[PDB]
């Protein structure tokens, strides 16, 4: 990563936390292409350097995602490691997470609009299975928007994937358990069991999210009851937008050997019509 010099990064508003992180919104002072000095928007996600198992699977993530560019993965511009804390400097999207969005638009969009997001997402994942890259982070909040949907020109919105943060078989157990039904449930029967099939089951519980205008799946649920959830094999419900139901359970597959491809599921949605 590209090393920012901490005077050149100033922090503007709080974002809040994420999972072992605390996240701002600021800007980076750089020299740009012709050597134009620009003040660049920014997302800068901050990790506790006494926290360094966390910190060292959080960076080593984001490092090699990185090294794979895609139109489809945030860019990453740096880290700055020379404060008392550690921290990625990333683009910052303008419209945020995919989940907020839709709750905040009160689902008004439409089945073609989520079908082209479940497109862009299957996209990204088909790059990072033919990269062996497994994110083990896939869910709607971390799906960012880029751009809106323009009824005039015809583009469609456009999303990136996060960094894949803290690998799970590092966090304590309590948060995969928080995080059923994202988590799959042979991970939570031993996190070493984190395989490319992983991100196929989370991709079909974001899809879900997609389908139920960015509802949590299980929500009323604690997470005694979300293991129980899986200890008798349930699937989730049909989400509101029935349209995805079938491709949401043949990713959901309790068998991780049988889920299917992300080629496979990308030819399913154009037939519609660290660790
Ligand atoms: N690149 C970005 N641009 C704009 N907003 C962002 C970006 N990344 C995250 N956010 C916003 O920052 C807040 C915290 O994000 P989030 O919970 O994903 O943090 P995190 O550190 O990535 O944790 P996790 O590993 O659980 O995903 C949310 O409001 C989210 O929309
Ligand atoms: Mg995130």
């Given at each position: 990563?590209?090393?920012?010099?901490?005077?050149?990064?100033?922090?503007?508003?709080?974002?809040?936390?994420?999972t072992?992180?605390?996240?701002?919104?600021?800007?980076?002072?750089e020299?740009?292409?012709?050597?134009?000095?620009?003040?660049?928007?920014?997302?800068?996600?901050?990790?506790?350097?006494?926290?360094?198992?966390?910190?060292?699977?959080?960076?080593?993530?984001?490092?090699?995602?990185?090294?794979?560019?895609?139109?489809?993965?945030v860019?990453?511009?740096?880290v700055?490691?020379?404060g008392?804390?550690?921290?990625?400097?990333?683009?910052?999207?303008?419209?945020?997470?995919?989940d907020?969005?839709?709750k905040?638009?009160?689902?008004?969009?439409?089945?073609?609009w989520?079908?082209?997001?479940?497109?862009?997402?299957?996209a990204?994942?088909?790059?990072?299975?033919?990269?062996?890259?497994?994110?083990?982070?896939?869910?709607?909040?971390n799906?960012?928007?880029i751009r809106?949907?323009?009824?005039?020109?015809?583009?469609?919105?456009?999303?990136?994937?996060?960094?894949p943060?803290?690998?799970?078989?590092?966090?304590?157990?309590?948060?995969?358990?928080?995080?059923?039904?994202?988590?799959?449930?042979?991970?939570?029967?031993?996190?070493?069991?984190?395989?490319?099939?992983?991100?196929?089951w989370?991709?079909?519980?974001?899809?879900?999210?997609?389908?139920?205008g960015?509802?949590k799946?299980?929500?009323?649920?604690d997470?005694?009851?979300?293991?129980?959830?899986?200890?008798?094999?349930?699937?989730?419900?049909?989400?509101?937008?029935?349209?995805l139901?079938?491709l949401?359970?043949?990713?959901?597959?309790?068998?991780?050997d049988?889920?299917?491809?992300?080629?496979?599921?990308?030819?399913?949605?154009?037939?519609?019509?660290?660790?």
């Amino acid at each position: 990563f590209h090393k920012i010099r901490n005077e050149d990064l100033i922090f503007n508003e709080s974002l809040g936390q994420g999972t072992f992180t605390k996240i701002f919104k600021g800007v980076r002072r750089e020299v740009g292409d012709y050597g134009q000095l620009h003040e660049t928007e920014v997302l800068l996600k901050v990790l506790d350097k006494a926290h360094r198992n966390y910190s060292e699977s959080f960076f080593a993530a984001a490092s090699m995602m990185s090294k794979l560019s895609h139109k489809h993965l945030v860019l990453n511009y740096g880290v700055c490691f020379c404060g008392d804390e550690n921290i990625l400097v990333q683009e910052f999207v303008k419209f945020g997470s995919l989940d907020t969005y839709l709750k905040k638009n009160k689902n008004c969009i439409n089945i073609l609009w989520k079908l082209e997001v479940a497109k862009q997402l299957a996209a990204a994942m088909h790059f990072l299975e033919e990269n062996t890259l497994i994110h083990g982070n896939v869910c709607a909040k971390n799906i960012l928007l880029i751009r809106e949907e323009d009824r005039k020109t015809g583009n469609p919105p456009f999303i990136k994937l996060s960094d894949p943060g803290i690998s799970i078989t590092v966090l304590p157990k309590d948060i995969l358990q928080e995080r059923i039904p994202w988590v799959p449930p042979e991970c939570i029967e031993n996190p070493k069991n984190l395989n490319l099939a992983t991100d196929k089951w989370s991709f079909g519980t974001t899809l879900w999210e997609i389908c139920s205008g960015g509802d949590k799946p299980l929500s009323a649920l604690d997470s005694q009851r979300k293991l129980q959830f899986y200890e008798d094999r349930h699937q989730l419900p049909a989400p509101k937008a029935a349209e995805l139901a079938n491709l949401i359970n043949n990713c959901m597959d309790y068998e991780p050997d049988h889920r299917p491809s992300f080629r496979a599921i990308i030819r399913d949605l154009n037939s519609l019509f660290h660790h």
